Copies of this chain bind each other. A is one copy, B any other.
Amino acid sequence: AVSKVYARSVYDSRGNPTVEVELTTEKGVFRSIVPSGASTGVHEALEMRDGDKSKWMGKGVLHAVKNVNDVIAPAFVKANIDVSDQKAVDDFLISLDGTANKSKLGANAILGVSLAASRAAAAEKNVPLYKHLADLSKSKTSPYVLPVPFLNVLNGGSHAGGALALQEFMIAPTGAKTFAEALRIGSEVYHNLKSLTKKRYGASAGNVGDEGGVAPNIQTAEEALDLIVDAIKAAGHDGKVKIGLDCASSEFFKDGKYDLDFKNPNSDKSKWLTGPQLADLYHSLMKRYPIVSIEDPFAEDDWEAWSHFFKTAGIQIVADDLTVTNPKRIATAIEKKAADALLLKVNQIGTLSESIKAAQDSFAAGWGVMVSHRSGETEDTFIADLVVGLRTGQIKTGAPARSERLAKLNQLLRIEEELGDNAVFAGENFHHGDKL
């Protein structure tokens, strides 16, 4: 049984505080580290920030730490809950909170305990975490599916100077035969990308953003896409590597229109595009480049632009700001046929049970699921076991640079090695990895 629950403050990949939870059982101490999330959030679970400008720039998690230590811990020990019954753990946490967006205790305090329990349940059951996570989600286990990693290589929009409004350019080595191969291939494209970048834009152009990709001063989408196609080519992996985009269009949505030069800041309003004109630009890009996935193509409440686009897209369309891992939000997206893949961010909903529940509903509607990292990550490898337990066949966990990213990619290499012949690489079937 659980004899102790403790929380301490530690730091995320950006140097901002985050919550670390330690759970003690008769089998040892189990720990989890929460990724940074939102402290203000409609439709999303809110993490709790101290807000004291005189400490950590107002990003402490001292309260959140107190909620775990002074509130949950005492209650949790007394409840004497079976960690194996994940739903029981989560229903307990939720009831303790009593808010819909975990704003009383904080999503950060709750998640930390929710993930540590699953670690402790695995230990107790004597199986690898991915296997316990597969038990919980009632996923097929013969074979297990290793996912295609969607590696961030280049960033624009709010994460770069230059005129480029699209936010993230990813490469996906769908052509590989094992996870180890896709990771090698992906790292070689990445390294060629850096060489080219430093050569065409300067030494500075070689530094990395929060997730590990470059941020040269780029003017257009073609410009960026051309750079990546050169890097794929230069690495000799043409045909084996596809492109993924994250438009994060909520960022340049203004007055019912889309401003492709939003950094302008004298943006010719005559050039803003309507949903349909935007869909024509994506169609163009899609014809010239090997794009297989497009995330957040339209704004988070622009329902009709999604539906319209969806009808003729023909590639995977990922909902991220549109669904913010919110089931009420997912059901609507499903009903409106706005997309066919969900970006899953466990800390956006706050509990393991609700995160598994959100993927199950997506799967039932024929949607694929892309498990995802946060901007402010940690050394914790939880999402690697989660992607395999869920059998989604696709993960977005950054570039092949910075260990908060590589920790997860390194964990996928171990799992693959351990499964032997009981594992298959999703490949070209990343979309529907669950039905493989």
Contact = CB atoms under 8 A, between A and B. Distances in A.
Interface in A382-428: 399-404, 406-407, 409-410, 413-414, 417
Interface residues of A, number: 48
A123 to B, nearest CB: 12
Given A184-B56, A379-B410, A402 B400 contact: no
A55 interface: yes
Nearest to A195: B57
Nearest to A14: B401
A137 interface: no
Contacts of A239: none
Nearest to A202: B161
Interface in A212-245: 214-217
Interface in A4-21: 8-16, 20
Q: Which secondary structure characterizes the binding site on chain A?
A: mixed
Contacts of A406: 10-13, 15, 378-379, 404
A191 B214 CA distance: 20
B208 A215 contact: no
A407 B379 CA distance: 6
B403 A407 contact: yes
B190 A15 contact: yes
Contacts of A401: 13-15
Interface string A266-294: 00000000000000000000000000000
Contacts of A202: 161
A183 B8 CA distance: 14
A156 to B, nearest CB: 11
Contacts of A160: 203-204
Contacts of A302: none
Interface string A189-204: 0110000000000111
18 contacts: A9-B413, A10-B410, A10-B413, A13-B402, A13-B406, A15-B191, A15-B401, A16-B187, A56-B187, A160-B204, A161-B202, A161-B203, A204-B204, A207-B207, A207-B214, A377-B403, A402-B404, A403-B403
Given A13-B402, A204-B215, 17 more contacts: A8-B414, A9-B413, A13-B401, A15-B190, A15-B401, A15-B406, A55-B184, A56-B188, A160-B203, A161-B203, A161-B204, A204-B207, A207-B209, A378-B406, A402-B402, A402-B404, A403-B404
